[PDB]
Every structure is written in structure tokens, then in C-alpha cells.
Amino acid sequence: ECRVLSIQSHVIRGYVGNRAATFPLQVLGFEIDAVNSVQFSNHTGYAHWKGQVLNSDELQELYEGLRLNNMNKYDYVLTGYTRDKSFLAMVVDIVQELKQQNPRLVYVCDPVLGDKWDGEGSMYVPEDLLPVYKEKVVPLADIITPNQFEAELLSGRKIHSQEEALRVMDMLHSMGPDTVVITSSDLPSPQGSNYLIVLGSQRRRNPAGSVVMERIRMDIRKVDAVFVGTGDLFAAMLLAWTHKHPNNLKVACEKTVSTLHHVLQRTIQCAKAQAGVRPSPMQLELRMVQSKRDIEDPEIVVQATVL
Amino acid sequence: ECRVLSIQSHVIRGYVGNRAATFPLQVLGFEIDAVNSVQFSNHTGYAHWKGQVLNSDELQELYEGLRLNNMNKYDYVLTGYTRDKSFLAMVVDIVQELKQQNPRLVYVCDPVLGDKWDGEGSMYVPEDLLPVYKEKVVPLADIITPNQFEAELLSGRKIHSQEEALRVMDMLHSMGPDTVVITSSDLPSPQGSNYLIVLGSQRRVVMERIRMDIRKVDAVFVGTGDLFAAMLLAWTHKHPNNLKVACEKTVSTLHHVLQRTIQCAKAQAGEGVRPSPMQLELRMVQSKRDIEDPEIVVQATVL
Ligand SMILES: Cn1c(=O)c2[nH]cnc2n(C)c1=O
Ligand SMILES: Cn1c(=O)c2[nH]cnc2n(C)c1=O
Ligand code: NA
Ligand code: NA
């Protein structure tokens, strides 16, 4: 089996965090264990929400149970939105130990920090997490999925073009991860302003022992709606597809993105049908269960360009 | 869509409570929402375990979030192992309101209280819960899945035979639930000493009673009851007026999961060697196909 330790948020209603990542990965045959970092009624995008949060001591306690039972052996660790520094610090110590047990362990990290909605975006998490991500998390990460804003904060350099983005990706590689994917863009696109850019870069040592790097690009059609959990789903699927195609970033990224496409298209349709009228957050909840078939064998609806 | 609110335990490693009921129900297309009554590193059958418990106040606030957003509309509610009196009490108040919100809501309840090994009965929860189950839970439930021991405790009458079991089930029906299934019993089967009898009764007035003779296994699995209730919910949903088929698919599904689980357990633990709780964890993920369309391997007989 292939074991994944996913430490993310949980909601009763809806799909974000572990709710967005668990079903798909289970459907794909992964033994995914879910540590819920928070338990809320629904995501914070709704008008109302209530719930509890897990603290760093409780996380450590849970890991103790696993350790005591000699069940602290994983192939992958997967994290995303993290709200607290001591929690993030604990996540770091846990990954560090799991990597000692298994040096081949792959840590997939979605470095959630914030986004843009003008020019100079804003953060979604305490600023004191940035230094921890820079000095502790990223260095341990093997695969990261920052958006442009996050790539800039992590690298400490702004991005105004594709070449600058690639330079940032090289900087991020030097910080630690062999696979870097700047998930969202807003860089010029030959197809217009209705498209966003996805850039991916993967460094690996081939059979002959040569260290090479593969770079790809995708121009994805934007959507006129605010979805939640897509980044969590993107990271989970990237994990799954790079696992299946370890030396082919292109195919891995094309399947990840296509899976997202099918889920979002189905979600958009159902959302509209449930009215007209801008759908509510509830109606825009990802149609995960209904996308089982697309998750298993996604029809490739987009092709990446080689860089 | 068919929404299900499942209030059960959560474990990081393994499959029990919500871990045993969610994946299968999702695979089957249900929009199941999971309220984790606890979050443990693994079930209590291991040498060690750590975790936290959700208290009744936390359950209420989580529900408040749903209510405030008008997301308190469910087609089903699913509960199982509960340990606190106050938590269970909070659970009935919620089902109470959810039923007020949706009169057609079906409440599937697995009355976890205890079980009888050799002959004597052992309790799994504080006895201060029995009164709550009898007086408030069961009366609210529409489908219950007690083993023989639990049925005896709920009805207050002992069972020594099949017809006494059916009379107890008639008693449980009068208490409220239209569907009653005795998932496990000490009753004898002509199939041999290695089989146990399962009895089901559904009211809809017409009554449908069925019987299944199931093979036993010299191994202790955790989460099977949780999975049984989830699947019974799923299949009774697909076949609402046919307890016979709903139970054959439910039991057939468990068979495939346990069969696969036992084989992998022995493969990991050499022949002759008794598998550990870790090796005995249900092989849920690998049973996706069996959950979607279970090959029928057991026939129920209409009584
Ligand atoms: C996007 N998103 C959310 O909106 C959210 N809300 C609560 N947890 C959450 N998590 C983990 C998340 O990733
Ligand atoms: C059988 N069983 C257990 O033994 C257990 N232990 C902790 N949660 C548990 N749940 C939800 C359960 O169903
Ligand atoms: Na992101
Ligand atoms: Na039981």
C-alpha cells in the first residue's frame, strides 16, 4: 500500500481541506490517514460558521499514539492551510521524524499564505508563519504548489513575467523541493485575459545518474465564481498523479488539471441549475462524490506546452 | 441529492466509526457529512491510543453553524458507538429538530451497548446510557441494528430461540423503528456450528421478516458493525420495500471486505500466526468495487 498522512481542516458540510483531498485519494487507492486540524460546520466563506481547532499539543499527542503503536511509517505527508505557528512548527517536527523512518518519504506542501485581488494581495494566515515556511517547511518539502503571490513571498522576489517566474521556481528548488508548481498566475496569455497560467518545474536524477529538469506550462480558462477547496484538491491530485508518473511532470500536471476541470464543470452546471442568480457558497460546493469516475480516469482536456 | 449526517468516531489510522462509514457511502453516491465525535490515533483495540473527545457543547455549536446557514436538512442521520449520556442526549435533540425540519428523515441507529462472547454479557458503555436509548433514542430511530445482547437489553426480554427473537423485534417495533435487524446472535444454524443467524423485520400494515445463516470467522474485526449500518442504510435506500435484497447486498458487501481483509492479514502474518489488530484493519480502499456492486454470496429466506 501507499500511505499518506494528510494534516488539514475538516468541515461537516462541504469540501475543503481533508474533505477535498480524502475521497479522491481513497478512490485512487491510497491509504490516506486524515488528521483534522480543525472541525468546522462549513468553510469560512459562508455567512456563518462555528467549530473547534486542534492545537499543537493535541497534534503531538495524536502522533504519539501512532508512534507508540509503531504506525509512524508513511510514504507521503500532505499539508495545506495552516493557521498557527506552533502548529506549523509541530507539523515540521513530525515530518522530520517521519523522514527519518522513511528517507524516501515525499512531503507534498501547499504553502497557503494568501493571494491577490488588485495588484499587491493580502495574507490569509498570520505573518509569523512566513519565516517558518521559508526556513523550516519548504526546506523539508519535496513538492510545493504556491500561487504567484506565495511564490513571491517565499522567494522574496516579485514576478512580472514567465522568465521571472521560472527564475523564482529555480530559487524555490534551491530552497528544497524538486517539484515546484506555481498553481495560479495572471501573467500574459496568448489566449487572452480569460486565461490563467500554470507553470511547473521538476528536477530529478535519471537512471544514468544525470540531474535534469523538466518545465511545463498550461493556459487554463478562468471561471466567474469563487470556489473553495480547489487548491486542496489540486495538491492531492498532483500527489496522486506524480506518484503514478514520477518522471513525467507533463502528464502528471495534465491529469491533475483535467480532473479539476471535470469537477469544476460539473460543479458549475449543478450550481447554476440550483437557481440561475449567482450561486451561493453552498451551491458552489465541489461536486466531489459525483465526480468519482472523472477522478479515476480523467479525460485529458488540456495539453501542457513544453518549456 | 441524498444527504446523510453521520455522528461517529474518527481515527487517523484504521477504519471504525466514520472512517468505516464515510468512504463506502461516498462511493455509493451519498452526500455524507461526518461529525467526528472523537479523533483518536487508532481504535481502542490496540496496545496504545491517544486522542480527544467532542463534548456535547461542541456538538451543539457545530450544529448551530449548519442551522444558521440553513444546511440542517438531511434525508438520513446515522449514529453508532456513543459513550456519554450528555452527548447522546444532545444527539436526540438534534435528530428531533432535523425531523421537525424534514418529517421524512430516516434515522439509522446502531445501539452500541455491548455483546456476549462465550455466554455471559459484557457491556461496552456506562449503564447510565441504557435508559436514554430505551426512552429517547430508540423511540426516535427508524432503523436499528442491535446484536442479540443489545436487543435483549432494549426489550428487557431474553432470547433463546428464533421465535423469541422475532417477538423481541416486534417489541422494538412498537417502541418506534419500522426496521429492525439482529446483526448477530447465539442462535444455531443447520449449516453447522460455524454459522450464526441474522434476523430482519420491516414494517410498512404489512410485515416482512427474513433470515440469513452466516459463516463465522476466528478473528476479531473492528468497525464491521459501523460498516453494516452504513451499507444497510445505502441498500434499504435503493430497495425501500425489499428487506430481503437490502440485507443480501449489505451482508455480501461485508463478506467481500472481510474476506479480502483476512487474506491480507494472514499474508502479512505467516500461516498459523494470529494476525495483529493492525493487520486486521478492514481493507476498505481496496474494496471499492465490492461496495459499488457486491456479488451476492448469501440468500435471505422470507419467514
Ligand atoms: C480553502 N480552505 C478553507 O476555506 C477552509 N476553511 C476552513 N478550513 C479551510 N481550509 C483548510 C482550506 O484550505
Ligand atoms: C467498534 N468501534 C470501536 O471499537 C471504537 N473505538 C473507538 N471508536 C470506535 N467506534 C466508532 C466503533 O464503532
Ligand atoms: Na493556493
Ligand atoms: Na454492535
Residue numbers in the entry:
A (entry chain B): 4 to 279, 282 to 312
B (entry chain A): 4 to 207, 214 to 312
Give passages from the manuscript.
PL kinase is one of the key enzymes involved in PLP metabolism. In the presence of MgATP, this enzyme catalyzes the phosphorylation of the three inactive primary forms of vitamin B6, i.e. pyridoxine (PN), pyridoxamine (PM), and pyridoxal (PL) to their 5′-phosphorylated forms, PNP, PMP and PLP, respectively. PL kinase is a homodimer with each active site exclusively formed by a single monomer. The ATP binds in a shallow cavity at the active site, while the vitamin B6 substrate binds in a solvent-inaccessible deeper cavity opposite but facing the γ-phosphate of the ATP.
Theophylline is bound at the PL binding site in both subunits, with an occupancy of 60%. Occupying the same position as the theophylline is a 2-methyl-2,4-pentanediol (MPD) molecule at 40% occupancy. Possible contacts between the active site residues and theophylline involve a hydrogen-bond interaction between the hydroxyl group of Ser12 and the N9 of the theophylline imidazole nitrogen, which is also present between Ser12 and the pyridine nitrogen atom of PM in the sheep PL kinase structure. In the theophylline complex, the C6 oxygen of the piperazine ring and the N7 of the imidazole ring are adjacent to Thr47, but any possible hydrogen-bond interactions are considerably lengthened beyond 3.6 Å. In the sheep structure, Asp235 makes a strong hydrogen-bond interaction with the C5′-OH group of PM. This interaction is conserved with the C2 oxygen of theophylline. In addition the C2 oxygen atom is involved in water-mediated interactions with the side-chains of Asp235, Gln11 or main-chain nitrogen of Tyr84. Both PM and theophylline make hydrophobic interactions with the protein residues Val231, Val19, Tyr84 and Phe43. A bound Na+ in the hPL kinase-theophylline structure is located at the ATP binding site, and is coordinated by five well-defined water molecules. The intricate water-mediated interaction between the Na+ and the protein is believed to stabilize the active site conformation. Detailed kinetic studies with ginkgotoxin, theophylline, lamotrigine and enprofylline showed the compounds to inhibit hPL kinase with a Ki of 3, 50, 56 and 228 µM, repectively.
